[PDB]
Design a protein around this ligand. Structure first.
Ligand SMILES: CCCCCCCCCCCCCCCCCC(=O)OC[C@H](COP(=O)([O-])OCC(O)COP(=O)([O-])OC[C@@H](COC(=O)CCCCCCCCCCCCCCCCC)OC(=O)CCCCCCCCCCCCCCCCC)OC(=O)CCCCCCCCCCCCCCCCC
Ligand SMILES: CCCCCCCCCCCCCCCCCC(=O)OC[C@H](COP(=O)([O-])OCC(O)COP(=O)([O-])OC[C@@H](COC(=O)CCCCCCCCCCCCCCCCC)OC(=O)CCCCCCCCCCCCCCCCC)OC(=O)CCCCCCCCCCCCCCCCC
Ligand SMILES: CCCCCCCCCCCCCCCCCC(=O)OC[C@H](COP(=O)([O-])OCC(O)COP(=O)([O-])OC[C@@H](COC(=O)CCCCCCCCCCCCCCCCC)OC(=O)CCCCCCCCCCCCCCCCC)OC(=O)CCCCCCCCCCCCCCCCC
Ligand SMILES: CCCCCCCCCCCCCCCCCC(=O)OC[C@H](COP(=O)([O-])OCC(O)COP(=O)([O-])OC[C@@H](COC(=O)CCCCCCCCCCCCCCCCC)OC(=O)CCCCCCCCCCCCCCCCC)OC(=O)CCCCCCCCCCCCCCCCC
Ligand SMILES: CCCCCCCCCCCCCCCCCC(=O)OC[C@H](COP(=O)([O-])OCC(O)COP(=O)([O-])OC[C@@H](COC(=O)CCCCCCCCCCCCCCCCC)OC(=O)CCCCCCCCCCCCCCCCC)OC(=O)CCCCCCCCCCCCCCCCC
Ligand SMILES: CCCCCCCCCCCCCCCCCC(=O)OC[C@H](COP(=O)([O-])OCC[N+](C)(C)C)OC(=O)CCCCCCCCCCCCCCCCC
Ligand SMILES: COC1=C(OC)C(=O)C(C/C=C(/C)CC/C=C(\C)CC/C=C(\C)CC/C=C(\C)CC/C=C(\C)CC/C=C(\C)CC/C=C(/C)CCC=C(C)C)=C(C)C1=O
Ligand code: FES
Lengths: 89, 53, 63, 100, 49, 65, 53, 169, 383, 49
């Protein structure tokens, strides 16, 4: 269970050479699912001593319809007001 | 000119920054807890039109 | 890069003739500009990096 | 009259001066943009401009970009990097080949 | 176990109390369902066992 | 008091929902589709929301069956 | 297992350039025994004939 | 003249270039070509079986193992030399102006107010120490880790593999 | 001199990379978040300032016990005589929810007595429309009513009466003086208030903070929210009010806390004072008291560049230069790039632009070979 | 007998004593909040938990 490729490949003890001694290869230890990065953008920039990883998270993905409707109320009222202005114009 | 031009104000600012006790001074609050900080004059009038933020 | 020669500039090599009339460009005060000397720059009068890719001793003039 | 130095990479040769200039300009821009959030908050080298969870504010980052570009007479490439902290600002300023 | 004893633990898990309680409740419910399934299977397979 | 009903959201609309206890309080003694799917959903939610690896893997094994 | 986890494992390959160096030799000098001008003065004299020089 | 602070900084920074002593982490044993123990592999033997593929792969494996060991040793020596050079090199920046080219006289100051202990899985903190340019020589050196020998693999398997029957035709 | 110290600050640990289980602060602190102790050595006076949201039985009984134990020489309470009469008439209530059941009855304390002149009628209209709009923006429930004094102040007043201690009433949040100030202030309109309140959250940080605070309020409830109320949260709410209506915020907060400080400092009978006030007025009163007494906590000046590891940066640069020189000498060539670690901010990996640190003025410039392997001897040392 | 109530009590004890739910290992937080904040419940509610 790893999130970062460098941490995943730094010290690997379940390599084929090590596992061949016991000759047991569990299906739960597949490289396909062994590591998976996070869904947030991460990019490296030069630091004072070495590369450092900065994460760019822009918006959340768990907002709900109540919050959305509360944020949208002003737009609906503005639409109504503009329509009323047009009608009275 | 063959030398890159910097304004006298910029050169003076660099010379002041070379000091080990330099800190921004055009602040309304003593954020850096400097014992010699002096409250700058507030540029707000009686109407207080520009206070809105 | 090389500094600004006060009217005493001789290119190290023979540069490409980018144009036969100059560019009327608005320069900002105190901003460093890297004028292209070789004459093949793709960014206009300013250096684009093609000097490093072309065989020439003409280096950009930083002024 | 103080004659400007002949050497070019002064900002690169003086990391401390560049960092102080970056801190000053970023602090001024932040206080002018969102006073209620940065008036009482000192700006140091370790200061970052993200929320408590790590999300960044694009408006604040672009304001910092504009402040840095005006101060150093350079053009920051917004699409390539985002200045979410003073360390990133310093990295970009030092990376730029013609800062002043 | 030896590595954890030597180097402590990585840190603390950021979880909600509601999620904690629901996890415990789900564990209890799963255990109860397992017991019910065991009893029902025993009753069904009594004749064959 | 319009805000008290418009801008005030119910606690259930924000906080994660709990387990419906009445659904499991009394169950039939038949190892039928209802009990099987209840167990499947319980194990699936536990796997989704749990940090315990030892219990999840055995939960995965039971969930396949 | 005890011995394997009591000592570091063999490294895995990494594809990062560490202090990369020019594949060719040093960049031709502005002035010296052989300069970039000498190279530049070769494109205009290029022939591949049927006889040696 | 070097101040006490400068001496302490030098002492704590010279510890960043200490060799890891990898000799205790690897089996530095050269493989022996099967011709030394099997008659049918040796060319000078009277019972030599001329097989282009088998001998080819045997010598390829032996040479690969030997080359891996040799380059491991050479990289270790080069890393030792580089670390010695880095430790013994001069550091002009220590004589610069504090706050411009050197840390302020007060030293590093932590202006944060943490409330909980930091996690041990910090990616930047891990990486900045794990991957460094000055350690490139030893970071990518393949070696056989020192592990307890298993009879079924390190004793029994070679014996049965070597005792395979051989056919002239 | 003006003591320009931090006040109304809500940003927690801006220098820490918080996230996941590494939080920035602990908002939940029922006693410290609302209890403050101040001292004036010159007059030999002690002040116990309490910030109450009037929606916590725990804090109410804590304040009652504190008053009983301290036996203050005087007590100041931010309420009025009408509310005191209503509260004393209301008897046999010991629960904050039970008292909140009377919240409408206690709201009668906002007499806001004014004549019906044409100007006063225009005012009343504008003020009540703005009050409706600002209450809509607040969106607080009946459980959390910070501006309606309740059980805590009732217990404080009752204990003061039992102990025969002077009681000084400071008025509700909107008292006669505050209403007069609002009338003097002309910038007050429901439409402009709506526009500014829906345009205030101009940053994702502000939007997320607003959402977090109000979701926490909804989930926990009035009492739990009051208990978990923190100084940073109160400062954020003050700044949010400033953004909503800075002109009204001035009068409501700054002038009110200045007047409260005046009352507590210039016209306090005894040496021991127990003050109960709305929590968001506590920061200003405390700041004014500390500035007047010259008893601010001694802080150490923080260098803006003190947290930068210039030594580490220079050491890394020197190490990279030495490594490049050594590699160049070994390979009988020159470095391909002068970047310590490759980064894609500059498109040097796939464009003509390079990063080479080689600059000199003329053929006799001593810095000609700086950054090149020719600057080092066979021992890998600078010449 | 494998009585339902006794088995429920025993399984609750097993789940809580397994050590996977030790409060020392968890950093309780609201979770639904945009920023990571500690538990905001009342003191009585915390004691009840
Ligand atoms: C029947 C015939 C019989 C003949 C008998 C024999 C006669 C013998 C005659 C002997 C002498 C002949 C001399 C010939 C010269 C040839 C060599 C030469 O010129 O090259 C040297 C030339 C040196 O140039 P230069 O003099 O140093 O000037 C460089 C400056 O950067 C240039 O920049 P600038 O500083 O000049 O700036 C120009 C302009 C820049 O502004 C503009 O953008 C121009 C337009 C402004 C608005 C004007 C509105 C009116 C309508 C304009 C329509 C065209 C505009 C198109 C714009 C396109 C934009 C994308 O400035 C402005 O900012 C705007 C000023 C506007 C003021 C308004 C004044 C009154 C109205 C006239 C305006 C004319 C403007 C210039 C137009 C130039 C062509 C486009 O070397 C080169 O580099 C060659 C470049 C390629 C040249 C191609 C064209 C060759 C022919 C040119 C001569 C035309 C003669 C036609 C005569 C026809 C008679 C029938
Ligand atoms: C209700 C309102 C409705 C309105 C409707 C619309 C209005 C009508 C349509 C308008 C269409 C406009 C099309 C042009 C777009 C201009 C874009 C622009 O402003 O760029 C900003 C651009 C960059 O701004 P910046 O960065 O701030 O730099 C400002 C500097 O001052 C920059 O100074 P600089 O020195 O760095 O450079 C300026 C100039 C300086 O250098 C030059 O002048 C370059 C060329 C000459 C070099 C040699 C100089 C020595 C004298 C040469 C004489 C040449 C004669 C032969 C010309 C060709 C044969 C006729 O160089 C150039 O502009 C390069 C152009 C080179 C190609 C020229 C070929 C022109 C072909 C068309 C000729 C038509 C002739 C009609 C005659 C009618 C009367 C008989 O600035 C300019 O281009 C400045 C001029 C502004 C535009 C003037 C336009 C005048 C009218 C053009 C009409 C064209 C024909 C009609 C086409 C459409 C209808 C069919
Ligand atoms: C016939 C035409 C009908 C149609 C047109 C109607 C008018 C135009 C529409 C106006 C709509 C908007 C409302 C504007 C006025 C607002 C006044 C206000 O709120 O003042 C606050 C004022 C102070 O109240 P407070 O501070 O809550 O407590 C006062 C205490 O009593 C404590 O007081 P205190 O005991 O200390 O003693 C002082 C007290 C003493 O007060 C008394 O009770 C003493 C009574 C003395 C005799 C009263 C009659 C003399 C004055 C008549 C009004 C002026 C002429 C009206 C006719 C104009 C056309 C010909 O006086 C005051 O407190 C100040 C009173 C001054 C305000 C009222 C004066 C203006 C009223 C007329 C409308 C203004 C625009 C007129 C435009 C044209 C002419 C310029 O409130 C009142 O006293 C309101 C009383 C009821 C007013 C009803 C509307 C006016 C009726 C006038 C008689 C018309 C003939 C009857 C038939 C009418 C048709 C059914
Ligand atoms: C059959 C019989 C039936 C009888 C039924 C009777 C039923 C009971 C009726 C009860 C209601 C009446 C009670 C009256 C008691 C008065 C007691 C009293 O005077 O002592 C308290 C009173 C205390 O005053 P207060 O109520 O406390 O108010 C103090 C404020 O400073 C005062 O200033 P403010 O705060 O009120 O502000 C005034 C105004 C200041 O702004 C202005 O300059 C107003 C004008 C702006 C333009 C409005 C557009 C229309 C054109 C108006 C043309 C005239 C304006 C002249 C401006 C001159 C500027 C140099 O404010 C503004 O800035 C503008 C606001 C207006 C917005 C537009 C509202 C809608 C349209 C109506 C506007 C009416 C405005 C007031 C008009 C007053 C008369 C001129 O004491 C005095 O001041 C005594 C002074 C002597 C007054 C004369 C009294 C005796 C002579 C009048 C006898 C009339 C008899 C008519 C009988 C009609 C029926 C038969
Ligand atoms: C009926 C005839 C016509 C009307 C006649 C006149 C009105 C009669 C009825 C009302 C009579 C009483 C008037 C008010 C007396 C005063 C009440 C009072 O005490 O309220 C003050 C209230 C105290 O409450 P609290 O202590 O917060 O406790 C909260 C509880 O939820 C407890 O909350 P509460 O129960 O105290 O709620 C207070 C609320 C009590 O009043 C009400 O609830 C209102 C009742 C009447 C209206 C009901 C409307 C119902 C609508 C839905 C039904 C269907 C409508 C269909 C319509 C169709 C046609 C359109 O006060 C108001 O809102 C009064 C508004 C009066 C004017 C009514 C007319 C408004 C017209 C607006 C039109 C639309 C806008 C303009 C046009 C736009 C489009 C172009 O707040 C203050 O003391 C404010 C202090 C100033 C600073 C505030 C700063 C806020 C921002 C910072 C927050 C963070 C603070 C720091 C951190 C935390 C602490 C450390
Ligand atoms: C067919 C007829 C239809 C009539 C419909 C009229 C609807 C008018 C709706 C106005 C809403 C205004 C809301 C903003 C706040 C107003 C002030 C407020 O809050 O009131 C309490 C204020 C405050 O009074 P108070 O201070 O005594 O409040 C008591 C409550 N405590 C103790 C908490 C303070 O009341 C007033 O100041 C007086 C209000 C009544 C004024 C009447 C004036 C004359 C009206 C004439 C008729 C209407 C106009 C013409 C219509 C023509 C139609 C064709
Ligand atoms: C001729 O008639 C008409 C039309 O033609 C048919 C029209 O089109 C129209 C056009 C206009 C319209 C507005 C369309 C009208 C359409 C209508 C009414 C049909 C559509 C209705 C809907 C979409 C509403 C559907 C929603 C619901 C029924 C609500 C469902 C709610 C549920 C199930 C609540 C469940 C919640 C719980 C059980 C609580 C759980 C809580 C927990 C804490 C979890 C448990 C946890 C623990 C720990 C125990 C009109 C007016 C009309 O009159
Ligand atoms: S100088 Fe023309 S491309 Fe660099």
């Amino acid at each position: 269970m790893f999130r970062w490729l460098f941490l995943y490949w730094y010290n690997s003890t379940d390599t084929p050479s090590a596992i061949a001694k016991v000759n047991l290869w569990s299906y739960i230890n597949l490289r396909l699912f062994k590591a998976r990065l996070s869904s947030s953008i991460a990019y490296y920039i030069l630091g004072l001593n070495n590369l450092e990883l900065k994460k760019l998270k822009i918006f959340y993905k768990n907002t709900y319809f109540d919050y959305i409707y509360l944020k949208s109320i002003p737009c609906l009222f503005l639409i109504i007001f503009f329509t009323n202005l047009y009608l009275f114009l | 000119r063959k030398e890159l031009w910097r304004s006298q104000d910029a050169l003076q600012e660099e010379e002041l920054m070379v000091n080990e006790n330099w800190y921004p001074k055009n602040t309304q609050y003593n954020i850096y807890n400097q014992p010699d900080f002096i409250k700058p004059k507030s540029g707000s009038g009686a109407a207080a039109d520009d206070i809105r933020i | 890069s090389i500094p600004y020669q006060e009217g005493k500039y001789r290119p190290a090599s023979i540069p490409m003739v980018a144009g036969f009339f100059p560019y009327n460009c608005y320069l900002q005060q105190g901003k460093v500009y890297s004028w292209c000397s070789c004459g093949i720059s793709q960014s206009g009068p300013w250096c684009d990096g093609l000097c490093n890719s072309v065989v020439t001793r003409c280096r950009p003039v930083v002024f | 009259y103080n004659f400007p130095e002949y050497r070019t990479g002064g900002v690169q040769a003086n990391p401390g001066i560049t960092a102080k200039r970056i801190i000053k300009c970023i602090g001024e821009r932040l206080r002018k943009y969102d006073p209620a959030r940065w008036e009482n908050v000192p700006i140091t080298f370790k200061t970052h401009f993200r929320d408590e969870n790590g999300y960044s504010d694009v408006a604040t980052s672009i304001q910092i970009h504009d402040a840095l570009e005006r101060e150093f007479g350079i053009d920051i490439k917004d699409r390539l990097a985002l200045v979410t902290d003073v360390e990133t600002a310093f990295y970009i300023v030092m990376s730029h080949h013609d800062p002043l | 176990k030896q590595f954890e004893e030597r180097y402590g633990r990585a840190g603390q898990i950021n979880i909600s109390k509601v999620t904690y309680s629901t996890l415990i409740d789900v564990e209890k419910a799963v255990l109860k369902m397992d017991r019910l399934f065991r009893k029902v299977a025993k009753f069904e397979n009594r004749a064959f066992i | 008091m319009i805000w008290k009903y418009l801008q005030r959201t119910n606690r259930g609309n924000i906080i994660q929902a709990g387990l419906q206890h009445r659904k499991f309080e009394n169950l039939p003694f038949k190892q039928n589709f209802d009990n099987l799917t209840k167990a499947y959903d319980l194990r699936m939610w536990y796997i989704s929301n749990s940090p315990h690896e030892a219990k999840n893997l055995e939960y995965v094994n039971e969930l396949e069956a | 297992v005890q011995s394997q986890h009591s000592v570091p494992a063999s490294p895995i390959r990494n594809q990062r350039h560490i202090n990369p160096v020019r594949e060719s030799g040093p960049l031709p000098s502005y002035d010296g025994t052989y300069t970039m001008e000498d190279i530049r003065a070769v494109f205009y004299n290029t022939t591949v004939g049927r006889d040696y020089c | 003249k070097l101040t006490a602070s400068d001496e302490a900084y030098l002492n704590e920074v010279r510890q960043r270039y200490v060799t890891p002593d990898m000799e205790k982490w690897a089996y530095l044993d050269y493989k022996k070509h099967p011709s030394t123990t099997l008659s049918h592999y040796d060319h000078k033997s009277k019972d030599y079986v001329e097989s282009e593929r088998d001998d080819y792969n045997a010598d390829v494996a032996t040479n690969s193992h030997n080359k891996l060991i040799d380059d491991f040793k050479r990289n270790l020596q080069m890393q030792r030399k580089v670390h010695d050079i880095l430790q013994k090199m001069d550091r002009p920046y220590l004589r610069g102006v504090p706050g411009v080219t050197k840390n302020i006289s007060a030293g590093l100051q932590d202006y944060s107010a943490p409330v909980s202990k930091k996690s041990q899985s910090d990616p930047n903190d891990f990486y900045r120490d794990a991957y460094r340019n000055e350690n490139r020589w030893i970071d990518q050196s393949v070696f056989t880790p020192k592990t307890s020998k298993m009879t079924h693999y390190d004793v029994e398997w070679p014996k049965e593999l070597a005792s395979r029957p051989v056919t002239k035709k | 001199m003006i003591s320009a110290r931090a006040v109304h600050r809500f940003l927690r640990n801006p220098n820490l990379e918080t996230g996941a289980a590494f939080r920035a602060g602990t908002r939940f602190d029922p006693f410290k978040n609302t209890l403050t102790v101040l001292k004036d050595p010159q007059n030999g006076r002690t002040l116990y300032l309490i910030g109450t949201t009037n929606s916590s039985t725990l804090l109410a009984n804590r304040t009652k016990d504190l008053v009983q134990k301290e036996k203050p020489d005087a007590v100041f309470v931010q309420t009025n005589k009408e509310w005191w009469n209503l509260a004393k008439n209301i008897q046999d209530v010991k629960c904050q929810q039970e008292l909140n059941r009377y919240n409408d009855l206690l709201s009668q304390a906002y007499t806001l007595s004014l004549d019906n002149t044409i100007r006063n009628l225009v005012f009343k209209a504008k003020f009540y429309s703005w009050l409706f709009v600002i209450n809509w923006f607040k969106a607080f429930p009946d459980d959390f009513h910070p501006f309606i004094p309740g059980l805590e102040m009732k217990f404080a007043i009752e204990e003061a009466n039992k102990q025969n201690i002077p009681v000084v009433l400071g008025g509700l949040e909107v008292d006669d003086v505050t209403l007069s100030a609002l009338k003097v202030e002309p910038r007050l309109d429901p439409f402009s208030q709506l526009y500014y309140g829906y345009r205030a959250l101009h940053n994702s940080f502000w939007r997320r903070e607003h959402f977090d605070n109000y979701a926490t309020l909804d989930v926990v409830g009035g009492e739990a929210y009051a208990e978990s109320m923190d100084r940073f949260r109160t400062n954020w709410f003050v700044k949010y009010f400033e953004k909503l209506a800075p002109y009204q915020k001035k009068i409501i907060v700054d002038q009110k806390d200045l007047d409260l400080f005046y009352a507590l400092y210039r016209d306090t009978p005894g040496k021991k004072i127990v003050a109960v006030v709305n929590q968001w007025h506590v920061p200003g009163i405390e700041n004014h008291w500390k500035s007047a007494t010259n008893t601010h906590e001694p802080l150490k000046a923080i260098n803006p560049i003190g947290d930068m590891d210039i030594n580490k940066y220079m050491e890394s640069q020197l190490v990279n230069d030495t490594l490049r020189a050594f590699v160049s000498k070994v390979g009988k060539t020159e470095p391909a790039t002068w970047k310590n670690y490759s980064t894609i901010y500059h498109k040097d990996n796939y464009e003509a632009e390079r990063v080479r640190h080689v600059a000199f003025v003329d053929h006799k410039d001593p810095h000609m070979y700086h950054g090149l392997p020719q600057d080092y001897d066979d021992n890998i040392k600078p010449k | 007998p494998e009585d339902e109530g006794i088995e429920q009590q025993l399984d609750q004890q097993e789940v809580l004593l397994s050590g996977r739910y030790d409060p020392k290992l968890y950093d309780f937080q609201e979770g639904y909040t945009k920023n990571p904040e500690d538990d905001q419940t009342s003191l009585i509610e915390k004691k009840a938990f």
